[PDB]
């Protein structure tokens, strides 16, 4: 194809602002306003009286489970999925964390997933449909 | 890549300078007074065009009542009496009719006066 006739998608490159450079637009004072602290710059997100200082209730740690909501789990067609197959088949990205499932609309057929722990009411709807769930003994 | 000003600035300046013909003094030779004179000259060109319309208006009129009064009526009681003669409406530069054919401007005087009776 002609390199003369290559053309980038319209609208995918727009031109830079050339600030200065005429009374055809953006004259004299640049984008800037006139006097004032607008000039060679500094100072951040700070109002320089009293910045809305509200009080501080605090506790330092945390550690949260990796999620497997079971609504995708039922259309899965493949069943009886041990979860170390699952991280290495799809889903469950987190290597540093532990896995948990939870209720999302339905459950339907049988299955048997070996997750690190799960909601108690999944056992209310996984045990129905003749399924086990292994908390990691 | 450096991209110095060369050839660009001289071309622009020379076009300004060439707009300056018989401008007096450094109006014709120094770029800065040439360009500055041209700013004020912009003002004058536009205003004057509109005004030249109104100026020939004035010259028109000033001939027309001179002929009118030569026939014993002023502009006022004339351009009235053509318009009161209604369909007579030639209006645009009656000046020239008064200024070259007096046999005709006399007939137009008689027409206006007949219409005012």
């Amino acid at each position: 194809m002609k390199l003369h006739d290559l053309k980038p998608t319209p609208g995918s490159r727009k031109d830079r602002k050339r600030v200065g450079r005429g009374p055809g637009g953006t004259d004299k004072t640049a984008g800037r306003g006139h006097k004032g602290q607008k000039s060679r710059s500094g100072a951040g997100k700070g109002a320089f009286f009293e910045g809305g200082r509200s009080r501080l209730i605090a506790r330092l740690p945390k550690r949260g489970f990796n999620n497997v909501g079971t609504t995708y789990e039922v259309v899965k067609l493949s069943q009886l999925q041990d979860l170390e197959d699952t991280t290495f088949d799809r889903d469950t990205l987190e290597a540093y964390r532990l896995v948990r499932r939870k209720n999302r609309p339905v459950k339907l057929l049988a299955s048997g997933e070996i997750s690190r722990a799960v909601t108690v009411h999944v056992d209310a709807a996984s045990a129905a449909a003749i399924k086990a769930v292994e908390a990691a003994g | 890549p450096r991209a110095k000003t060369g050839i660009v600035r001289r071309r622009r300046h020379k076009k300004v300078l060439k707009r300056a013909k018989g401008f007096w003094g450094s109006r014709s030779k120094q770029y800065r007074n040439a360009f500055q004179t041209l700013l004020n000259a912009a003002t004058y060109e536009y205003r004057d065009r509109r005004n030249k319309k109104r100026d020939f208006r004035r010259l028109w009129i000033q001939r027309i009542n001179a002929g009118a009064r030569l026939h014993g009526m002023n502009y006022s009681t004339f351009i009235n009496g053509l318009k009161r003669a209604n369909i007579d409406l030639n209006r645009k530069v009656l000046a020239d009719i008064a200024a070259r054919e007096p046999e005709a401007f006399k007939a137009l005087v008689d027409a206006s006066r007949n219409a005012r009776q």
Partner: protein, 196 residues
Amino acid sequence: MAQINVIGQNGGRTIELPLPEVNSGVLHEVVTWQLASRRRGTASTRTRAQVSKTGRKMYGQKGTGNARHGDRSVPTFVGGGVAFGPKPRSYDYTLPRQVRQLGLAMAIASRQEGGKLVAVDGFDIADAKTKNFISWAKQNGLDGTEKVLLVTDDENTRRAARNVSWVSVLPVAGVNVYDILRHDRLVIDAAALEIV
């Protein structure tokens, strides 16, 4: 589709090419990425200050009657210090993989309007001599009214014509959405990369 080969076989073969009339959009952005990635970043210029070589404080803050001024090393001076000059930098960026593999596929695809000669082996060149490569190509309509890009595998066989003004060699791998797109035809040769 599936154009005829040369010496080895002569089978048909056309892969499902990305051919929605192969837009110039993706093709252009791949070419721009390559010309950008290969650019060297070697354009130093002297900083306003300390990289420039000059002095001190010059004279009287007030009262000399001359203008204000501070040192001989500033952009308003005709001395030294470019303010906002080029400094060495890199322009290379990881373009997403899907788009460059789509790019070379589209490039090969763009030559199926009218172009792309045999992918197979066709080397009746007397070990490695240009006049004989010129004859081989001359029997294929490669008379050199059109620049042509060759790709293959045998150093003995590309060596035949690294010289000729129309052709240029590249080995297997090392193909280029830009190279095959900037030559007027593609002697694809090397059937191995062509088929899977």
